[PDB]
Amino acid sequence: TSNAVLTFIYFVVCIIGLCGNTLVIYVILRYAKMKTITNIYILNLAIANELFMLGLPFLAMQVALEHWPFGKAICRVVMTVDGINQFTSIFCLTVMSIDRYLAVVHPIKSAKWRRPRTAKMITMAVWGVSLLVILPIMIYAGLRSNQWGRSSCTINWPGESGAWYTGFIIYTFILGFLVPLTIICLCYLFIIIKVKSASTDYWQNWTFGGGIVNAVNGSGGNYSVNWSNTGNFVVGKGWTTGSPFRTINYNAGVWAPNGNGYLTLYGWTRSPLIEYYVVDSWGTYRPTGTYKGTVKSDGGTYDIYTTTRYNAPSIDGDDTTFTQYWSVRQSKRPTGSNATITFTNHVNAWKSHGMNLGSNWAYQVMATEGYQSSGSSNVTVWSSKRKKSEKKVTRMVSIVVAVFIFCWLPFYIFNVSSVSMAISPTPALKGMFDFVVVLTYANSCANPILYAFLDDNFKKSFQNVLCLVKVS
Amino acid sequence: FXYXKTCX
């Protein structure tokens, strides 16, 4: 019997998801360490899955007896519990990713928002809207019995049988799959962008003229220069597309000019064509220009200057004319440890002086720039260094999202085809429905197994609890 | 379709 196989599968899924999701609800409530923001969202996934793995034995016995014998009260609780598992589950996963977005993309502007009282308040809102969403299931859960006396537990819609069917699946498809995945996946888009634009991606090594310029392209944002020159050179690492909100970080392990050299951030806009500098250290010559004012940023104090370069080479060609905005520190910045340039502060300052930058952002790099000199410099460059702790958690949610999509999409795909349908179901199609549904039920015993493979903290808690051996 | 998330 395909019932025999199906009943067996139901039952092993249930056994495994009960162990899996009880352990997960345990370790989070039993350890202080395990109570975290992501974990608070995770507990509710496990609660919903647990609630559901409890109803499964009844559904298993329906398949094995081809008959619902438990009564109308237990049917209502199983349908509510099966519905909870379809909507509360992913509604927990959407809130989980929005949380991931906010903590990577906007770590600064939503720290107050990311507190456990707000997680707990939010997670009582995840239930309220699930129960609102599954109200058709709750209200209309009941027994339908065929002419041969066998009752099946289902949702007896009030009208004609398929009338509410096409209505219902499209409701469920839109609430339980479309809208939440639309939300989820663009959360990870914007996260991919902030992760991808954090490190430097542009290497510049432009030696004009005579002398010696040995430029080294190291790992990450590292580079060094060794020069004793007679020309002009610019070496540095940065971003092919600059930003007026990027806060640039760097560390100049060596900044030893003998002669004319600048340590400086610099870049271009077009529309209008402007080259800009934020100079932090120099050699024997502090660059100036037409004085304009001062700005205080990142501990230190800079003068603002403008210059105009006539018939000079630019990113727009060999013979353009353009303005240059400068922020030159009034004294040489100490070197050797992590130093920040909060670029906005310079943009705002130039703006208040009527120096506006362009619409169209070209490159933006943290360069060593020498002018007929010698010297050495070693500089590492970056922007918004990621927290390794946070990386692994954002990786785990991404994969829990992945298995969910994998385990449920054949189901919504099977359900949406089935409205168009014109022929009565075939055994092959019937066996496909039961496989596709088993795929969804299996989803609620994966999450825990994944927590043990993708979270170290979950792995040791599981080992602590089941008295296993911790061997570094 | 079937009766609910099962075709027997």
Q: How was this structure determined?
A: X-ray
Q: Greatest CA span in chain A, whole angstroms?
A: 100
- For A68-140, strand residue ranges (E) read none
Distance between CA atoms of residues A326 and A266, nearest Å: 9
Q: Spell out which residues of chain A touch residue B5, defining contact as CB-CB under 8 Å.
A: 59, 82, 437, 440
What percentage of chain B's residues is helix, strand, coil (to nearest 5)?
Answer: 0, 0, 100
Q: Spell out which residues of chain B touch residue A82, defining contact as CB-CB under 8 Å.
A: 4-5
**What's phi and psi for A53, nearest 5 deg?**
-60, -20
Q: What is the resolution of this structure in A?
A: 2.7
Across the interface, do B7 and A153 touch by the CB < 8 Å criterion?
A: no
Across the interface, do B3 and A144 touch by the CB < 8 Å criterion?
A: yes
Please, are residues A225 and A235 in contact by the beta-carbon 8 Å criterion? yes
Across the interface, do A430 and B1 touch by the CB < 8 Å criterion?
A: no
- Residue identified by tokens 């020498």 is A370
Phi and psi based region of residue A172 (left: phi greater than 0; alpha: psi -120 to 50; beta: remaining): alpha
Q: Spell out which residues of chain B touch residue A79, defining contact as CB-CB under 8 Å.
A: 4
Which residue type, as a one-letter code, is found at position A218? G
Distance between CA atoms of residues A111 and A429, nearest Å: 50
Q: Which residue in A264, A351, A339, A327 sits closest to A299, CA to CA?
A: A339
Across the interface, do A154 and B8 touch by the CB < 8 Å criterion?
A: no
For residue A149, give the 3-state DSSP assignment.
coil
Which amino acids of A are annotated catalytic?
Answer: 275, 369
- Strands A274-282 and A317-329, bridge-based pairing: parallel
Angle, helices A456-465/A2-30, rounded to nearest 10 degrees: 90
| Minimal-distance CA residue of chain B relative to A161 | B1
Please, are residues A10 and A449 in contact by the beta-carbon 8 Å criterion? no
Cβ neighbourhood burial of A323 (10 Å; 0-12, 13-18, 19+): middle
Helices and strands, counts by H and E, chain B: 0, 0
